[PDB]
């Protein structure tokens, strides 16, 4: 009764996709705690903030358009009607399912915003600030660097510090609902246009996705059994009898040439 | 006997709903204790707290609608008499299934209060306290921001911050406990008016219901035996044999049409 | 062994409603520890500790009443000589399965005597007492209304602060104990007018309880599998086969009209 | 072989009488630790013991009167020679098993005798004591309310307060055990004197219990089998087969008029 | 092979003697560390300790009697040559089986010796002592009664007062050994002459025994089967079929004189 | 393959007598730490020690002995040539297995010498020791009881105090070893006269012990079985049928005389 | 397969003399940690460490060889050619099982040395130390006692007292040493003149020793059995049926003459 179940929830789309985000959301969780400083220096801090933030995203989406077989085959069958439109809505299925993670590793490193504040900490608006003043911009640059990596100045520019932390992070925040609601709008506005530029019915849909499916795996199982029955025969001319039988009558001792004969597989 | 009871329960609504509110309850509480921090800022806290209060609420309804598959057939079939009515008490189904999410997630963000507080510290009524008449505006409203994000001042101003910060607490939970008698009042105003132009009798509803879910599954595991069957068909054409049989007899090697031939699948 | 006993548990009432007032007990326990804080203002406490009090008690009323099935077919049978009575008894089944969340609700809300001392801590009775003669009436129930909220005053106000105190959780818990009794009295009488004017002897009801369940699952059942032949010989008209069959020697396939054909369910 | 030993125990009278005790212990320790509070008032305090100590021994002993089964069964043969005897031992037998509750709340909550030091400490014979004498009366009650609920004074008050708390004590431990003694005697000489008014002999006692029990789970038995039997012919005459059979080979369909048909239940 | 083992320990007196002893002293122990406090008083310490060493030994004693079935047909046997002797046989097992718990009951409470000083701390012999001599009897008794209750003097008290506990602790656990010895010689003089009055030899006593137990369980088994048999009859008049035959032919619907006819059980 | 070895260690005597060891340690060791406590006293000293050092000697000894069914049978054949001899030898067989307990007890509460220490820590020979010359004869008692008990006098008493504890522990544990080797030496010595005595040669002693052994249980076991068979006899003639049988066509209602008939027993 | 290995390992004498040794070793640990105390007397310390250097082995070395059931038939054959050798290597081979235990009780109670120190402490060899000079012989026999028992007195004392303990020690292992290389010698030699003097080949040892054992075994099986079938044959004469047997269609009932006829064994 196991197997059935596992069936079960291999088929239903929305455990797939609540695990890849669990995985992404606990992921991003252990590597910010583990492998994350801030640069603190003048002009490397933009970019070591901007890369935390974008390239996983990139590559988890990249990884997650690749890694789909049928992706691939359809990408050969476009590579040097109809099936203009049945390929367009199985790239869709493909994109539906891979775009789940990078989307969850950028909104999850926005609400928790300790990116974003070592990502613009050096654009922060000082205009209407008492100590600001006097310093020189070198000076004003190296002091407005130093507040994310760390605080050691008396309490005035620690209180000018929290100020600003707590601006970015209100930032990070507000930037990473607008883009859950943006991409949620967007991903159902896709699927509307999906089902409306559909030829098919309802129901011809899923018969199409079924045979689909089926299709790939019994022709995989028929032709591992079709090659498994002419290596067999394959053998039997070699030695002489079945690697299934028992008690078997003749056996035909190899000669020097029947090695040679077996060398090449017939492609 | 126990996929037995799984189904049983897959079929009473009560699991499913007391699954859902208590699934939000706990992700509401631990979203809250990870990652909410007051602005306090001058103009950028009431939005700061709206978007907390009311953006996943929404965001939560709108997935527990399209996520139901009936709905999009529904939605086909009405996108480009009797037929309008049971599509009414469909999508009236579909939308007693989906209200759940989020109007218990608005239910728990209202009672923790603690989202509200730092949504309306701003418009809080100060008309009749001893600090607050010689101040300005300006420094009237940056220390009255300052009282939800931190307590600094002396005693004073602790007292009149906790006087405040406890009627923002009694109108949270008042507006709450508003919502839940409103919401549930019509909730059941609708079930009756449901009860009321539904044409079908009390027995017909149940025959309706069981028809429509057993059809939807026993067309889709037909049609998935028919592809399977036809799949099968052209297997043979092509190498001369049964997937599932053994020792067959004949075993045809392809040819480099054939191969061609098998490229297109009829659609 | 097990399903015997789980339905031999399921007909015990005795056990359902022990379930009930159990987990009534537990969540009114929980709800009180985790989201209760007194208001302690001047006019907005009563109702914050009515609302408590009571919205709970009657929603979960309304819940128990509305969740019953049969309710709504009675009903439906009412809405737009014997039948009366009978229908009468069923409704008094029905009220006595539901009654138990909200009478327990109340009574442990009361008997923990939190919720009321909240409640009416502003209608004191301050007569005979050496500090409140001299204030004046404002100042007199901005000071009363601090006593539940928290104490900060030397030990002469801290004295007639639990005075009152105890006094109230005194006429709580008297409160409490009223209602039970009165409530359970109520009960045993209802059940003494049920048993008097029920027009069956003492063993035709049995039979009529055991007909009316055993109907209602019986025609569920049926109408499944009435519905499930004619959808499967609908499958059988479109494909040619029946979908539990194995080794179908005829497959139909299908025309662009048939799919239009199989569009609409007959109602 | 479990179901063997669990019926074997549901038979014996013992364990469901040691069972009962054990819950009324537990639940009254737990009553008593978590919801008891003095009111220490100058005369609503002998009420506060008395309500503790006697309304729920009544309310658990109509719980055990009513809850049984049997005892309504006879009181409708009774409500508008050897059957008044036999209905006599069925009333006795009742009575012995719910009399069982009550009793052993009533002893442990004397034998602990907290609620009755809160239930008399103001008819305290004060008499003979050094500090009593000088003192009117209204504070005389003021201040022998006192001791049970706090002690605040010096020696001498908290050695007379000792005193009078440890008198009572006794007091209410010898009435535990005065009840324990006549309870029990009252019980034996009641099973002697049902014994000496049996008009069955010693053998005729069990077949006549065995009988009882017997029937009522028989007729119950038949009757559901009957009913079940006759709604199934009903349903073959609506859809044209059995609910239980497989292939069935005749299916009619119901017209309009047959559900009007089948809304009836027939009594 | 497990019921097998129960039997034989069931059937073993030893392993049901060790039970009940081992059960009171656990009950003891607990009661003792639980409910129990001198009184400390002029007059009301002595039935203090008197009830706790006698009334619950003599309590258990004629629960041990009264709950024995066997001991009930005896007495109605008895109440309104070789009969006689075996009658005082039956008697004599029963009492051998019953006396076990009071006993044990005694024995551990004047071992444990905690109830003893209690008891008789205002029987102490004071005569030889120096700080006895000048206070009168009232004051006497009252510094007397002080000692168990608690010590708060100087050292020449608390010296007099550990060693006249001492001594009632030697006097107590003295009668208890008295009391084991005395028991254990009277049950074994009594077990003599039970062999030596019986007229039955060595073999025919168990033969007796395993025929009255045997007689008992198969005559009520015998009773119980023949109650249904003729229930079953019944109702098969009543309703036309047999509660557990499947696919019965003729169903007789019952009408509304055979309800009445079934009322009655025919006593 | 469980109640194999089950029944292999019944009869394995060495696992009987080590249990019964086993048991005796550990229940004197909990009686030795939980209610012992010396006296102190100046006559009633002595006989506390020997209450414990024997009394649970005897008393188990005589349990060890009567609790064997098979002695009270041979007493039976004794109280009102070679039976004579064989008498012997199963009376010798059941003192062996009797004697076990009492010795271990004895052992065990001597080489422990709590006990005799404070048995007889009043005739310690005090002759030469330069702080009891003065003191009278009554004070000499009285300050010597005091050592066991307590100690509370300076350096040079506590010294004379460990010294005559030690004395007195090195002469408990010789009086023990003295026991020990004596006991052996007397029971190797009289299994040496029961194999001398013995008219059986090797071989017809295993026979006779397992024809004693086996013919206990079967003549056991077949009178249960005649007395069952004959009861249900008397059942058939009383109300018509076996007990056992299914689908009884004859069932004979009893006549108010028959019930009178299966009053008496037959003996 | 566990019967297998049970009886695998019973047959491995390596097994059970390890398991001995373990035991005897965790025995001896205990009870020296337990129940040893050092006299620290004139002359009654010598006889404290004797005992339990010594006793315990002889006690053990006893149980040992009297426990072995073979040994009593053999001493039964001797009390009142190849016959005497045979019994010879019988009796070695019980020796070589008996022996282990109160030798390695010896050993280990040497090794671990606190049994020596307590034993020979008088014995010292003091003739070359400056504080045994001046003082009598009576006073340095009593300072020699205290070192083992306590040490009180300067560092020079407990110098030489850690001094003359460590040198008994040193004795102690020494002579455990060498009992243990002299015992296995022993064994060794012992072993060898019993492989010299046997008169029976390598083989024949084998046959003669599982002849010996399983002799033992199926006689008692045997003589079982008979002794069953005589007793069954004469239950049958008493009753008139077989205890076995089901539906037995004769019943005889017993005379009073039949009962004493049974009362003899037959012997």
Redesign the interface.
């Known amino acids: ?1 196991l197997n ?1 179940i596992v069936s079960s929830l291999q088929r239903n789309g ?1 455990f797939i996709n609540s695990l890849i985000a669990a995985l992404t959301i606990g992921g991003q969780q252990l590597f910010s705690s583990s492998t994350f400083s801030c640069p603190c220096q003048v002009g490397k801090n933009f970019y070591y903030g901007s890369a935390f933030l974008v390239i996983p995203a990139l590559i988890l989406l990249v990884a997650g358009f690749a890694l789909r077989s049928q992706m691939w085959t359809i990408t050969g069958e476009y590579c040097c009607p ?1 099936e203009c439109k ?1 390929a367009c809505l199985r790239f869709f299925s493909i994109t539906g399912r891979a775009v789940i993670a990078p989307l969850t590793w950028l909104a999850v490193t926005l ?3 300790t990116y974003y504040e070592c990502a613009a900490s050096e654009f922060a608006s000082v205009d209407h600030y008492p100590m600001f003043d006097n310093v020189s911009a070198s000076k004003r640059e190296e002091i407005l660097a130093g507040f994310p990596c760390c605080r050691s100045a008396p309490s005035d520019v620690i209180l000018v510090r929290d100020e600003i932390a ?2 970015h ?2 930032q990070s ?2 930037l990473g ?1 607008i883009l ?2 943006l991409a ?1 709008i967007a991903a ?1 506005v896709s ?1 509307c246009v999906a ?2 530029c559909s030829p098919l ?4 849909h ?2 199409w996705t ?3 499916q ?2 790939r795996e ?2 995989e ?3 591992e ?2 090659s498994r ?2 290596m067999m ?1 394959r053998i039997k001319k070699l030695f002489g009898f079945i690697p299934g039988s028992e008690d078997v009558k003749h056996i035909r001792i190899p000669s020097c040439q029947d090695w040679k004969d077996i060398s090449v597989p017939t492609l």
């Open positions: 009764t059935n929305i109809l049945l609400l928790t915003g707590l601006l992070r209100y925040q507000m609902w859950i609601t949620t159902l699927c089902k409306c019915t309802s129901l011809q899923c018969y079924s045979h689909l089926n299709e019994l022709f199982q028929a032709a059994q079709h029955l002419l025969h």
